[PDB]
Ligand binder design. Structure first.
Ligand SMILES: *[C@@H]1O[C@H](CO)[C@@H](O[C@@H]2O[C@H](CO)[C@@H](O)[C@H](O)[C@H]2NC(C)=O)[C@H](O)[C@H]1NC(C)=O
Ligand SMILES: *[C@@H]1O[C@H](CO)[C@@H](O[C@@H]2O[C@H](CO)[C@@H](O)[C@H](O)[C@H]2NC(C)=O)[C@H](O)[C@H]1NC(C)=O
Ligand SMILES: *[C@@H]1O[C@H](CO)[C@@H](O[C@@H]2O[C@H](CO)[C@@H](O)[C@H](O)[C@H]2NC(C)=O)[C@H](O)[C@H]1NC(C)=O
Ligand SMILES: *[C@@H]1O[C@H](CO)[C@@H](O[C@@H]2O[C@H](CO)[C@@H](O)[C@H](O)[C@H]2NC(C)=O)[C@H](O)[C@H]1NC(C)=O
Ligand SMILES: *[C@@H]1O[C@H](CO)[C@@H](O[C@@H]2O[C@H](CO)[C@@H](O)[C@H](O)[C@H]2NC(C)=O)[C@H](O)[C@H]1NC(C)=O
Ligand SMILES: *[C@@H]1O[C@H](CO)[C@@H](O[C@@H]2O[C@H](CO)[C@@H](O)[C@H](O)[C@H]2NC(C)=O)[C@H](O)[C@H]1NC(C)=O
Ligand SMILES: *[C@@H]1O[C@H](CO)[C@@H](O[C@@H]2O[C@H](CO)[C@@H](O)[C@H](O)[C@H]2NC(C)=O)[C@H](O)[C@H]1NC(C)=O
Ligand SMILES: *[C@@H]1O[C@H](CO)[C@@H](O[C@@H]2O[C@H](CO)[C@@H](O)[C@H](O)[C@H]2NC(C)=O)[C@H](O)[C@H]1NC(C)=O
Ligand SMILES: *[C@@H]1O[C@H](CO)[C@@H](O[C@@H]2O[C@H](CO)[C@@H](O)[C@H](O)[C@H]2NC(C)=O)[C@H](O)[C@H]1NC(C)=O
Ligand code: NAG
Ligand code: NAG
Ligand code: NAG
Ligand code: NAG
Lengths: 409, 68, 187, 50, 38
């Protein structure tokens, strides 16, 4: 079986890359400006100092993640202002200046789809999502203009049609197929990108994978805050009343269980919050690998990078995450043929060198693998070894010589 | 995003107000992470300057349907 | 930090167990040493858990190191930007205390001169394509070269193939293609 | 109890095996496109330099 | 292991002989020439 006809296909892909960098403090959470409590805690061990340690560790880890995944470029390339990319039309994913910040249409959709008293603050990230967008625009202009050469170093421009010819050549579909079908492939590309647009705008919230990081973290914070309302066995929950009601020599007692309960709650919180990030950065490392292998090059590794055979990938940002577009080659309309391993001619077998030997019923032909393109059998594309007896299973045919009739001139 | 007029040179950031840096108007491939784009360095008479970061050099490549 | 935790009372009378032994042996010794035990037990447990997480981290890095060894060393990879930066030639390992140190030997092209390209060279109505590499021009003499290092050669049937029409394809040029069999057939 | 049931998992392993016996790798990219086993093994050998 | 004769259909030509290290002579075969009998 072999395919007559094929479709370019465009798939989306989502990934978490980081999460909001909270930071909740010791003395405020536990008791918050009640120096009686402070004097009671100072002689507990060095617990909460090193809690603060761990948590700020998570916080710096987040921006380490974002810089490993996005700063995989070294400069800022930008696209030339004459959009003559040979039929292919990326105008939906490149920037548009009159959008307020330098987002892009699909970026802006992704942004519009997804949506204090207790010492617990939220630091701001170290890259501004504007800068993130500027990186991704740089990556787009890079992998578009310069081919994929800039994987190595100084970018080396090369026209887009040539580049996609090389992309095809990297999955065993000889160059010509592109040039002969350029217009068709271009229209396919365009309608696919447009379908992505209209899907995402009218999709369900199927950016859900980024939703889960934020929902989990925020519900954990709700539990931590709410925990402050439990008596924990003391006279009353509110510390400003326990202090202001009982005598000191009595106070120490009722404050004791309150301190131990709130500490144990804080430790449970930080213990879970460590594992949150310890898996987020696994995802982040996966995103860095996908970015470099897919965007700055081509991946011969079947189904690492969106399915079908692989051609090109484009990145886009998202709030605390990244979103790839994968552009792949897939065969759709197949058809029957009957084959055999080798062609015995004049007492010597022949095997083909790249493509399969294929028949339409009467004659025989040589074709490449993944897109039907019949040809005659000539000494050029085949090669010989030995008789035609050992090779199990065989069918007879005539091998034409591209030299004899020209020689017979 | 709160106001440092409430503090008991001077600047303002999306993360707070840092006290001491001369705020400058050029951007460098910058060292120290402060916040939300602002990032400091010791340079030149000499002091600490806190300033907007810049993601890198700009090299807009020439492209043409028949070059290589 | 763990050891320092032994110098703290956790809300008891002292930071040693022997003193509480000396002062008060009957039940109040229980209602005090209770706290020493509880606190010290936490400190140990909360050492163990974060040590366990750090262990997870090091195992992740160890498995990355294993894959990197058995791809960069014992073979030649084509995952791009895995073994270093640039096209990958080779690697050698070295061993540092508690870790490993890879020397990646990579091949990177630096000088760049530009030319003018074209998809195909029609002739007699048929269109040749290169077997590998692009066509290229210094202005007059079209040469065909591999994509990654400038060394030109003369265009030939033997390093091209055919598609016998030059109209559907967009952006062709015209030029003679050389043929080695004709001059050797002149004899 | 688990969601997929070990009988169902056996059906997936049977299918994912039948595919690779009959049609080579192709059924990971689209629809299966048949080749006879011997030829498929020949093309694997070609894929590793022999 | 699979010995073959050395001809134009399995070797290509790059440049001169006297710059590569440790080259040797041997007679390249040109299977056009036996057919170059006319
Ligand atoms: C590339 O695709 C975009 C996608 O819309 C095309 O944009 C339209 O361009 C026309 C100009 O002829 C405008 O009047 C429309 O408002 C644009 N949008 C739509 C939805 O039609 C664009 O024409 C295509 N080609 C180029 C060269 O940009
Ligand atoms: C191969 O497939 C492509 C699309 O999958 C076909 O393109 C369209 O085919 C229909 C059917 O005749 C035409 O009406 C359309 O005009 C074609 N599209 C364009 C943009 O022209 C293509 O015809 C198929 N070719 C073969 C030989 O099957
Ligand atoms: C199978 O392929 C052969 C090869 O092209 C086709 O045979 C051609 O048939 C037409 C008339 O039907 C002749 O004018 C051509 O000269 C034939 N070609 C050759 C090379 O002899 C054949 O039609 C195809 N289909 C079938 C069912 O056999
Ligand atoms: C596939 O197996 C069939 C068996 O039916 C082979 O058919 C040949 O012809 C008849 C079938 O009635 C048998 O007596 C022969 O022994 C079969 N030959 C062989 C080699 O099996 C068919 O040839 C086989 N396919 C290939 C490619 O060998
Ligand atoms: C390679 O790219 C450079 C950069 O655009 C081109 O440089 C200019 O080319 C024009 C036309 O010959 C000259 O008049 C200028 O003096 C060049 N600029 C410099 C700084 O030297 C160059 O032309 C391109 N190569 C070709 C063959 O066109
Ligand atoms: C590649 O881009 C150039 C840039 O405009 C195109 O140049 C035009 O080419 C046509 C036909 O070759 C001429 O009639 C025009 O006069 C050219 N433009 C100018 C400003 O002189 C060129 O056509 C493009 N290549 C292709 C294949 O379309
Ligand atoms: C390239 O060289 C060929 C070789 O003569 C010529 O092709 C002519 O192209 C024009 C363009 O329409 C045709 O009208 C002629 O019939 C073609 N043949 C001849 C003999 O003139 C022409 O010199 C060049 N072609 C182009 C498109 O530049
Ligand atoms: C391969 O190694 C051998 C062993 O050293 C080299 O043999 C020497 O070759 C030089 C040629 O300039 C002679 O003068 C020496 O006498 C040789 N050594 C001995 C022990 O006789 C050989 O040269 C090397 N290969 C090449 C191409 O130089
Ligand atoms: C390879 O063969 C060539 C020619 O067949 C040898 O070239 C000889 O070079 C010497 C110079 O030292 C001349 O005196 C000879 O006349 C040349 N020809 C022959 C046939 O000897 C060359 O020496 C050979 N290389 C080796 C390593 O033997
Ligand atoms: C295949 O062709 C050879 C060439 O003469 C012939 O001897 C042999 O009988 C043919 N095979 C069959 C099955 O007829
Ligand atoms: C706080 O700073 C913002 C930003 O400069 C400013 O708009 C606002 O007026 C300030 N608030 C006060 C009370 O000065
Ligand atoms: C801010 O930028 C302007 C731009 O002209 C410059 O004149 C001015 O000196 C800059 N401010 C400082 C403190 O350098
Ligand atoms: C192109 O290169 C050839 C060398 O084969 C040379 O003789 C010719 O003059 C060159 N043309 C230009 C315009 O540099």
């Amino acid at each position: 079986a072999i395919p007559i006809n094929f479709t370019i296909s465009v798939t989306t892909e989502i990934l978490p890359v980081s999460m909001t960098k909270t930071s909740v403090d010791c003395t405020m959470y536990i008791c918050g400006d009640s120096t009686e409590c402070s004097n009671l805690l100072l002689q507990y061990g060095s617990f909460c100092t090193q809690l603060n340690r761990a948590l700020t560790g998570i916080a710096v880890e987040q921006d380490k993640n974002t810089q490993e995944v996005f700063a995989q470029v070294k400069q800022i390339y930008k696209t030339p202002p004459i959009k003559d990319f040979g039929g292919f039309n990326f105008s939906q994913i490149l920037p548009d200046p009159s959008k307020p910040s330098k987002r892009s249409f699909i970026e802006d959709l992704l942004f519009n789809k997804v949506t204090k008293f207790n010492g617990l603050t939220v630091l701001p990230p170290l890259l501004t999502d504007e800068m993130i967008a500027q990186y991704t625009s740089a990556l787009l202009a890079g992998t578009i203009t310069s081919g994929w050469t800039f994987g190595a170093g100084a970018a080396l421009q090369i026209p887009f049609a040539m580049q996609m010819a090389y992309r095809f050549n990297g999955i065993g579909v000889t160059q010509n197929v592109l040039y002969e079908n350029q217009k068709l492939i271009a229209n396919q590309f365009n309608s696919a990108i447009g379908k992505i647009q209209d899907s995402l705008s009218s999709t369900a919230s199927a950016l859900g994978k980024l939703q889960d990081v934020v929902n989990q973290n925020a519900q954990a914070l709700n539990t931590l805050v709410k925990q402050l309302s439990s008596n924990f066995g003391a006279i009353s929950s509110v510390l400003n009343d326990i202090l202001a009601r009982l005598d000191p020599p009595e106070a120490e007692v009722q404050i004791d269980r309150l301190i131990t309960g709130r500490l144990q709650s804080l430790q449970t919180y930080v213990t879970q919050q460590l594992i949150r990030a310890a898996e987020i950065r696994a995802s982040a490392n996966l995103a860095a690998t996908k970015m470099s292998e897919c965007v700055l090059g081509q991946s011969k590794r079947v189904d690492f990078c969106g399915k079908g055979y692989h051609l090109m990938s484009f990145p886009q940002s998202a709030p605390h995450g990244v979103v790839f577009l994968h552009v792949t080659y897939v065969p759709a309309q197949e058809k029957n043929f009957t084959t055999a391993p080798a062609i015995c001619h004049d007492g010597k077998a022949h095997f083909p060198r790249e493509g399969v030997f294929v028949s339409n019923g009467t004659h025989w032909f040589v074709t490449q693998r993944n897109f039907y393109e019949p040809q005659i059998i000539t000494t050029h594309n085949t090669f010989v070894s030995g008789n035609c007896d050992v090779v199990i299973g065989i069918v007879n045919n005539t091998v034409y010589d591209p030299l004899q009739p020209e020689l017979d001139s | 995003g709160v106001n440092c007029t409430e503090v008991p040179n001077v600047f303002q950031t999306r993360a707070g107000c840092l006290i001491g840096a001369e705020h400058v108007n050029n951007s460098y491939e910058c060292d120290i992470p402060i916040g939300a784009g602002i990032c400091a360095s010791y340079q030149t008479s000499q002091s600490i300057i806190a300033y907007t970061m810049s993601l890198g050099a700009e090299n807009s490549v020439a492209y043409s349907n028949n070059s290589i």
